[PDB]
Design a binder for this molecule. Sequence first.
Ligand code: UMV
Lengths: 401, 547
Amino acid sequence: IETVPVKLKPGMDGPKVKQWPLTEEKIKALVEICTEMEKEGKISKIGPENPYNTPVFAIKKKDSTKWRKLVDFRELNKRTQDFWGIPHPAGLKKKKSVTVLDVGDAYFSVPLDEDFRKYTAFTIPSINNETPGIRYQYNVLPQGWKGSPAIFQSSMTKILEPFKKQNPDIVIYQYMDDLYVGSDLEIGQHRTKIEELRQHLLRWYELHPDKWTVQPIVLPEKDSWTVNDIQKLVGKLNWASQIYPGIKVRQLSKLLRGTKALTEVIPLTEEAELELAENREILKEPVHGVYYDPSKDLIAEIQKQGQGQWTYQIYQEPFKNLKTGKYARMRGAHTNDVKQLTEAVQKITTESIVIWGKTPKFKLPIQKETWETWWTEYWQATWIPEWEFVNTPPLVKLWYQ
Amino acid sequence: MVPISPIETVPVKLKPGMDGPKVKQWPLTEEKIKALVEICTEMEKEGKISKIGPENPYNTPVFAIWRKLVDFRELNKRTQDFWEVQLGIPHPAGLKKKKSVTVLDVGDAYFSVPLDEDFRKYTAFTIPSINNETPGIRYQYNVLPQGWKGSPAIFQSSMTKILEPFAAQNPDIVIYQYMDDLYVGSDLEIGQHRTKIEELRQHLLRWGLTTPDKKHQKEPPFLWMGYELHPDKWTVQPIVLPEKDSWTVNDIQKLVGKLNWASQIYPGIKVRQLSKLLRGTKALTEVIPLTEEAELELAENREILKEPVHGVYYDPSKDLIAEIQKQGQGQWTYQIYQEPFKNLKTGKYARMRGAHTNDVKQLTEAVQKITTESIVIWGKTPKFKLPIQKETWETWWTEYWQATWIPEWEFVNTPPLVKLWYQLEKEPIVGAETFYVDGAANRETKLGKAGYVTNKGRQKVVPLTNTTNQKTELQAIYLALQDSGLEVNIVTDSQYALGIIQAQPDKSESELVNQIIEQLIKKEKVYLAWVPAHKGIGGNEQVDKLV
Ligand SMILES: COC(=O)Cc1cc(Oc2ccccc2OCCn2ccc(=O)[nH]c2=O)c(C)c2cc(C#N)ccc12
């Protein structure tokens, strides 16, 4: 009910990001939504004296046909001054289950600092540039802005204070417009407690981290090896030697002596079996000296494996993986690779939020033009991470398969 | 007097830290001075400007060309940034046919909208006195000055706010604002349409805005932004390719501008060779002789631009179709239409700058471009007709290492067809010879060797001059492809060569890569396996090529 002054970083002007084209149905949906918000005072029309702009588009979240407005506040977020911090709950990832709630509506009851409102300007575009785009700016805390949870932190603490005092075994975390609730109860008791918390929030996404862990490097177990089998094994072991120190391949490379046909069966010598066993024992141990640095960026790499299977690795220093995973979920994206990649980016980003409380920088195995043409069609999250595009096929694809 | 409705002013400031302009006034001739005194006298009588005292420290130079011309370049440098909603013009193919269409230019556009009074002091200008024996006459602007940074945006926003209630209570007409002109259109009867036009110019008159009283001075066809807009069709203004003894850089750039601009409606315009003669010239006068390829491209261009071609307007009740054809040398052409032989518009796409490429990737890129353009113009993605079989696309995207997607599309059997030229095996081939290849080069002498040893005892090492490690690795693979049967397993340690081949090109800048592609096209089955180098992997002989 009282506005807190908000400013920008020194020497940085407001965001001036071009609005990308939208389909007619998305434009109409945004017109209806923004009209309703204007009648509620959440936004107001602006004049030509406001040169700032932030992209906007429309999505449809899970289990709902209602269009939702999504603002890409990435530029404004990185241009907004740093708000200060709460240490990340290291036990949220350890809990049995976590449910994600959308508390974005609660932001619209808190007004926004007047002098800052001109920096939240956005444009509903028109088809074929026929009429001028409808320009708005926010009067309250907008969804997607990083300052909205920081400002609403006190109010949120006051709302959740009774529930937190009632259940000390439930971990509550907040990121942007989402509230992550971790517990160890039963799925039924978990859902009933989630209804309890949502009505507690009313009068004022099942996710099980325990079913995801870190994945070791495994080697084949065969009774007969071909020249090709041993060559691939030596390739993967030589690759894993960048991660594990004591990996040695000289006794297995000793078997490849001579120009043999690739399909010829080679029996393993005793030295080769011993070397392979030592390499297994080495791979069973964790990686040496792998720590998380909150002052560094998280990097996520995704490999398309085929048949709707995807692999990923979150790290900070090369060959020092903080997390690895394999997303093979099939949900109406059998014939669309881009939808699969987008849902994979969203799941990986959610996991990163749960573990470290911030989003990683993605390396996407896709051409820029394809991704930038289609990714908003399958996006369902309220945040947006950063990404770059790898245009050279990485050789380490199968070594993660 | 009927009371005029006020026009809300736009608060304007200068850029942060910057101050208003202070520029010395030019010395003008006595004739020019008298002219500017008469002009500014009439303007002050009309209320556009006002005399100011000596307290104002800002000044902007003025000229007479009589017509007054104030040079606001410094104030524009110092004025804040505005939101210019004019970023790209509407494309005629996006318009919808209207039974009646009217043009209403608003006279005294910027001079009818008031200026923020706190900002008028920065528009001050002086008229020099005769013989400079009296202080020059000081003036400031009370309205939007033509030439100032904020006049178009403020004018368009004010016009939009004025037009909003009329458009709201008239959902059966469409209004477009453009500079000092308005374009209204409707499907009503001509009498009702003219009536609603009279209502519109009345509603604009309520705010003090004037429209053409006579018969509207512009009637179809309309010539606008290089276009011809006709009652039922549209096209570009005439494109004439000239005959020339010799063509220069400016002649060739004029021609490529005519061809690029004409390619949006004339199907099949090619510009690869004519624009290829501009590869790093950077000299407007440097005459460049045309290759016979460029002259042939010119002949085809004239043959297409022989007689006029028109595009139709958009009908939202019919499907939107986009068909693509391959032209060769990275050139693609496309037509967007809703009925056969009646195009909405046309266009082309050239491949990006790359060392390696294939037809499927380029077709994908062209599909993305057409998709974005279609969303811009019509607000939807069209159904595609592509010269590629369904099975070909299926194999491509299922086996491609990157993620890729094409929107809804169907196969059209119009040669040349995009196909996959080779596919590598997933597993080693039983019964096929195994070629262990390797190559190496000396960094100083540029001498190298490339070759293979096989499981059947076949061997070859070839010496090479003026080469590199990468070239000798590719050369080794090429040698194995030349000397092997229709089915072959190849073992290399070159991460470079595997990086190239796993990108699946059908065409390359390097002649060696293209020869490798030609060898792969002739093979039945090729399995390419990679091993680490210098790891004592027998067969892979780094020492055989390091001698
Ligand atoms: C700004 O909007 C545009 O750029 C499109 C645009 C639309 C327009 O006219 C229209 C006004 C309102 C709705 C649709 C319009 O055109 C529909 C298609 N068309 C076009 C011409 C014709 O006879 N008959 C038709 O059915 C006019 C008359 C324009 C005139 C000029 C000029 N001089 C420039 C652009 C114009």
